[PDB]
Amino acid sequence: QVQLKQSGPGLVAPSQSLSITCTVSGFSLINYAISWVRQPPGKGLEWLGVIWTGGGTNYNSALKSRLSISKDNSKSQVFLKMNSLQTDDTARYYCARKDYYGRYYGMDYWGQGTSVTVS
Amino acid sequence: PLQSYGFQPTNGVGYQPYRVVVLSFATVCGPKKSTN
């Protein structure tokens, strides 16, 4: 069954780095693209960035260039990296599947969610 | 069984209607391009 998994410890103190990973089944990274969304407590969801299906990354313009996202074609894993956190960055982060090939061009599935808290 | 939507110049672009003409498809032939 098509399904999205994402895992990580989440608990972070200010000014250090933690990374989150999204692991996928039921589909290939070649036929789809992956986008990440973020859910702070009680506030609306915001778009983080997208990895294209066959190479090439995109990031939110206002989001710092001091961060990177990474993926695994063979074993179907994706990794998001934040190299320095600040107390406004506490939020729940979600991975999501985007099918721009398909007739349903928009994002099809979303991650199961991870809590990321500061202190 | 008739519903009328009032249209006025004050009514906004969304509220105001825009004329729609639909063309459905030998006698009606396109121009024949002629060179020199």
């Binding site: 986008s35 969304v37 859910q39 609306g44 969801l45 915001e46 778009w47 995109n58 939110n60 313009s61 729940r92 979600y94 007739r103 349903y104 061009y105 928009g106 994002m107 099809d108 979303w110 969610g113 | 906004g12 672009v13 969304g14």
Partner: protein, 109 residues
């Protein structure tokens, strides 16, 4: 040129259909900037309702019906007694990135 808004208020008695409109900063939205509708369960559950500014998502019931009803993007759900208690977000594709709507709370009866 980045404002995204929703009424954030919805309440429909069963049997009557309602339209909720999400309005961008470019006036009437075109399909060129793709419109998306997503639904939030109170358990942080997400699903896709509408895509492509006219196309319903796969796996969401046809009772969900979203089109470019107004000048701006809109969504229409026929009244349901139980399963419509959720949050709804509108999404618009700017040339560079995605913008997500504020969210609308539906409380039937």
């Amino acid at each position: 040129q980045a404002v995204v808004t929703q009424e954030s208020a919805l309440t429909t008695s069963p049997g009557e259909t309602v339209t909720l409109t999400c309005r961008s900063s470019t006036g009437a939205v075109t399909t060129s900037n793709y419109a998306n509708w997503v639904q939030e369960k109170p358990d942080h559950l997400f699903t896709g309702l509408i895509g492509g500014t006219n196309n319903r998502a796969p796996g969401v019931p046809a009772r969900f019906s979203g089109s470019l009803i107004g000048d701006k993007a809109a969504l229409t759900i026929t009244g349901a007694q139980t399963e419509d208690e959720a949050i709804y977000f509108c999404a618009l594709w700017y040339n560079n990135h995605w913008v997500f709507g504020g969210g609308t709370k539906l409380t039937v009866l």
